[PDB]
Ligand binder design. Structure first.
Ligand SMILES: CCc1ccccc1
Length: 164
């Protein structure tokens, strides 16, 4: 398992514009199009992202291209963030995937506010970090996914994702 397989499990794959868990227009493997209520605004964002007139539908190859771009953006975002980079650099490979997953889902400024959890993760206090991470809107709104990500942080193994 790697970050692509992990997020593909968590985000799924849909080739037509859909609404994510928060009700926002999204496409592909969790590619957020807009937080605007307007489907037309989303369709415009999609056409801009893909570079052709899509009429709300893309191919699997296009979805995977957006996915590559989004994962890269998440990682780069972490590396450019003064609060996130040192924690990320302190982590092992598997836990780094859990970190990218959170930033992919909630964005960099969002996770950068997870201050107490970040400290515990940098200190390698895994059980404590796991407990702290669950005290969050994140956990309460998407508990099944949060539990998988937290288990990954707690154990540094892919146990939560085996058997998908
Ligand atoms: C809060 C988990 C985390 C750690 C490092 C970087 C991003 C996210």
């Amino acid at each position: 398992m790697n970050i692509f397989e992990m997020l593909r499990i968590d985000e799924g794959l849909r080739l037509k514009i859909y609404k994510d868990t928060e009700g926002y227009y999204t496409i592909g493997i969790g590619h957020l199009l807009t937080k605007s209520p307007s489907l037309n605004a989303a369709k415009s964002e999609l056409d801009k992202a893909i570079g052709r007139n899509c009429n709300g539908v893309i191919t699997k190859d296009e979805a995977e291209k957006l996915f590559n771009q989004d994962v890269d953006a998440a990682v780069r975002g972490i590396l450019r963030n003064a609060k996130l980079k040192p924690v990320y650099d302190s982590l092992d490979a598997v836990r780094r995937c859990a970190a990218i997953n959170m930033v992919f889902q909630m964005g960099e400024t969002g996770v950068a506010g997870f201050t107490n959890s970040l400290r515990m993760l940098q200190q390698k206090r895994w059980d404590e970090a796991a407990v702290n991470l669950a005290k969050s809107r994140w956990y309460n709104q998407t508990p099944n996914r949060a539990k998988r990500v937290i288990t990954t942080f707690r154990t540094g193994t892919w146990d939560a994702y085996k058997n998908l």
